Each structure stands twice: as structure tokens, then as C-alpha cells.
């Protein structure tokens, strides 16, 4: 449902879908797969349906936590909610 990003989506599958299938490809070749992923660009262009398309094609565990929801009305609850994720 989203075209034109095949150049960008190809690098996403290598850093997301690829290490979740075969983990020995990075050990034999000797390349450290990126653990974190940041997505830049002006707000309202990418992201959005891209993460949903990758999560649907992977068919595995997926956790989506909003960046503004970590803070809780209680004080010490903030660091505990981050650990539970």
C-alpha cells in the first residue's frame, strides 16, 4: 500500500526482518547489526504505516509504546514502566 520507499524499505528489512530470521549471517560475515533504529525526515512523510507493514510481514512479537506515555502520575513509576517494556 506504500510505494516509492522500496529503496528505504530495503534497508529497513535488513536491519529488522533479516536479524530476526537468520542470526548467523551477521556472525559469519562479521557485521554488527544495528540494535536501535532512528527514522529522520520531516514529520508526516515516512514512518506511520511503514512500521505496521514490517510488523505484519514479520508475524512476531511487536511492542508499540508512545514516547509521551512513559511518564506516570506517580514519581517512581516512570523508571519501572521503562524496564517492563
Amino acid at each position: 500500500d506504500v510505494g516509492g520507499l522500496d529503496m528505504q524499505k530495503q534497508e529497513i528489512r535488513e536491519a529488522v526482518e533479516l536479524p530476526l530470521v537468520q542470526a548467523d549471517l551477521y556472525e559469519q560475515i562479521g557485521i554488527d547489526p544495528p540494535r536501535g533504529v532512528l527514522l529522520y525526515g520531516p514529520p508526516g512523510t515516512g514512518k506511520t504505516m511503514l512500521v505496521k507493514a514490517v510488523a505484519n510481514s514479520t508475524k512476531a512479537a511487536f511492542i508499540r509504546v508512545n514516547g509521551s506515555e512513559f511518564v506516570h502520575k506517580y514519581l517512581g513509576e516512570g523508571p519501572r514502566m521503562v524496564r517492563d517494556v
Partner: protein, 85 residues
Amino acid sequence: RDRRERRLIFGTIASKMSLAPEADLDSLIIRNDSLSGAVIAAIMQEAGLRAVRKNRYVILQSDLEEAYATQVKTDNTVDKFDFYK
């Protein structure tokens, strides 16, 4: 983007939409200047919204050019710098 990365988005969204066989999407692609993905989504939606008040069902070619001038202007009336010094 360019006329390459953009035309993949128009043809993909038009699959779920209903247009006329005489409508040409390549006419607006040449005139695209400094656009994004969210702007393209609003063009296909507004083209179908105005068809209700115009007593139409499928999106014609005339409605694509009328609804394009709304989201192309990037600031207020000035586009970006408009043209002057």
C-alpha cells in the same frame, strides 16, 4: 522527490480509489514542486469529497487539478519565497 518516486504513490493509492479511464495522473506529476506523502494523500481524498457535491462517483480529471492547488501552497499565500527580491 522526483517524477519517479512520486508516480509510485499515485498509482498505488488509485488502486483502492475509483477514477475515470480518461483521467491522466501524469499531468499533475510534472507540475509537482516540493511535495510529500501526506500532501498526495490529501489530494486523492479531496478529489473524492468534492465529487459528492458535484453529483459524481468516480474521480474525474478536472477534479484532480482543482483539488491540487489547495495543498501545494506551503505557507499561507506565499508558497515558500514566492517570486521576488
